[PDB]
Amino acid sequence: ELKQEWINTAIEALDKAYVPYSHFPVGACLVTESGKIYQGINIENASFGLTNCAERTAFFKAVSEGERSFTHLVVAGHTPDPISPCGACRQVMAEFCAPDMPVTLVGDNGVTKATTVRELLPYAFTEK
Amino acid sequence: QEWINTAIEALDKAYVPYSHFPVGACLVTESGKIYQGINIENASFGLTNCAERTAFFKAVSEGERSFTHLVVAGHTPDPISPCGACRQVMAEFCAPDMPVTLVGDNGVTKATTVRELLPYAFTE
Amino acid sequence: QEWINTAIEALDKAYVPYSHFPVGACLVTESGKIYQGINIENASFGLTNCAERTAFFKAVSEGERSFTHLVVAGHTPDPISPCGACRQVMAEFCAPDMPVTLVGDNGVTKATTVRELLPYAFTE
Amino acid sequence: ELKQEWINTAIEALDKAYVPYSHFPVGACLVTESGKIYQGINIENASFGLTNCAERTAFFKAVSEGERSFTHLVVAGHTPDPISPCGACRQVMAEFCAPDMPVTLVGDNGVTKATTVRELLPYAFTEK
Ligand SMILES: C[As](C)(=O)[O-]
Ligand SMILES: C[As](C)(=O)[O-]
Numbered sequence A, D: 001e002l003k004q005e006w007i008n009t010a011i012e013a014l015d016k017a018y019v020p021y022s023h024f025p026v027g028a029c030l031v032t033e034s035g036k037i038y039q040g041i042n043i044e045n046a047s048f049g050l051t052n053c054a055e056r057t058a059f060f061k062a063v064s065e066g067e068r069s070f071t072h073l074v075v076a077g078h079t080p081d082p083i084s085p086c087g088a089c090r091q092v093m094a095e096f097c098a099p100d101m102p103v104t105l106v107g108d109n110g111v112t113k114a115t116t117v118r119e120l121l122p123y124a125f126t127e128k
Numbered sequence B, C: 001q002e003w004i005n006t007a008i009e010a011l012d013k014a015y016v017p018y019s020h021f022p023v024g025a026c027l028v029t030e031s032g033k034i035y036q037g038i039n040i041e042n043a044s045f046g047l048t049n050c051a052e053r054t055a056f057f058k059a060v061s062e063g064e065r066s067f068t069h070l071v072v073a074g075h076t077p078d079p080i081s082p083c084g085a086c087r088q089v090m091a092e093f094c095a096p097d098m099p100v101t102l103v104g105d106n107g108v109t110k111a112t113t114v115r116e117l118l119p120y121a122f123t124e
């Protein structure tokens, strides 16, 4: 039940995207230790390199409000296969999430992929 | 003063385990809503996000598109200077005439604007 | 003219499969050495690198630290504007007085400087 | 023999770093289809988010000179375990390199890790 709600939150973010250059929305639902969620949207810039992905938007929102303990991340796109977080997003994930933290990826027609931080970013570069 | 206080109080909440250089931001909408930003570093420095951009990403994620003021604060002898990446995100979302207040330690402030910080801006 | 030609000729070599918006750069050292930059996009747009920054990274990787001119070109009606991220990298490595020539289509040019593009720069 | 030369190139980049903020050098040796190499260095900025990693510096050098076919990447750091490319670097790797392209990571005391693009960035986000 909870996972279905998180998926709906990530999907709803697709209509909150700021993507006037790619027209490629991505949505995220980041779940905290308490179960409160932070929604992420893609936010582009005319200089493409300053674009901020939905996953990172969710982390920056949560971390700015003092969140440091995360239990799940859901990411959605309008894609034939489940949306894949880019490497920059995976690196921010690794800063704040345990390797075992589950990640649910969804795409068109209900396609889903169950994964984890450890699986998305093996041998991760960290403060360590 | 409330906007200055929001930016300064953010300094004690920043995620800066690598620089120990906190930056705070207060982004104000036309409706008067306040969005607070902090800098959020990463073990890979290039993935660090500035306080100004954190505030914009928060506000834009909640549908805000009309901004009337930005305050940026640091623990600096002179009023802190927004970096060029932050200025480019300001230009994406703010009118050139939108005022920007820069703050440092011991009450020092500098009044500026989007137009002055990023002249001949790269745009759409 | 050679510096302008280097920046314009880079436009046909850019890696821009997503924007199809090429940008070229020519970075000149005090010794007269030329470094050419192109923009290099990524499927994740946020990992895109601008032509100006490509030129700086090339030059700095070869030990260059003294820069006397930067030319930036685009296929634009007015002279192309460096984004704020590029301006911040210029400020890392260039004196405020270093001249910057901006170029667009049909011979349009704009003369500027690091100091004018990024006033009150965030620094060391 | 060739791999030892690439490792020396990546190690030599450690003395070409521009890292006045972290004092954490990273070196890279990117090998093209012809065997010509591009050396990468870490290049920091006072605004940390504009820092460019050694791996990406090597790719940007090579790609600016028309290179699009890469056969190996070596990365070096002064680290107890073999240096780990961050996720941003892995994402640029995936733009230009085949999943099977080998990656050699080295650290202090000759420690080495043999890996690949597919292993560093599974289920990679791409143009596809
Ligand atoms: C799937 As993405 C472009 O938000 O890293
Ligand atoms: C003053 As800043 C490092 O947040 O651009």
Ligand SMILES: C[As](C)(=O)[O-]
Pocket (backbone or CB within 6 Å): A047, B122, C023, C039, C050, C051, C052, C072, C080, C081, C082, C083, C084, C086
């Ligand atoms: C003019 As540009 C997109 O290289 O900063």
Ligand SMILES: C[As](C)(=O)[O-]
Pocket (backbone or CB within 6 Å): A125, B044, B045, D026, D042, D053, D054, D055, D083, D084, D085, D086, D087, D089
């Ligand atoms: C190991 As690195 C900081 O060059 O991604």
Ligand SMILES: [Zn+2]
Pocket (backbone or CB within 6 Å): A053, A054, A055, A085, A086, A087, A088, A089, A090, C044
């Ligand atoms: Zn991403």
Ligand SMILES: [Zn+2]
Pocket (backbone or CB within 6 Å): B050, B051, B052, B082, B083, B084, B085, B086, B087, D047
């Ligand atoms: Zn900044």
Ligand SMILES: [Zn+2]
Pocket (backbone or CB within 6 Å): A047, C050, C051, C052, C082, C083, C084, C085, C086, C087
């Ligand atoms: Zn730029």
Ligand SMILES: [Zn+2]
Pocket (backbone or CB within 6 Å): B044, D053, D054, D055, D085, D086, D087, D088, D089, D090
């Ligand atoms: Zn990296």
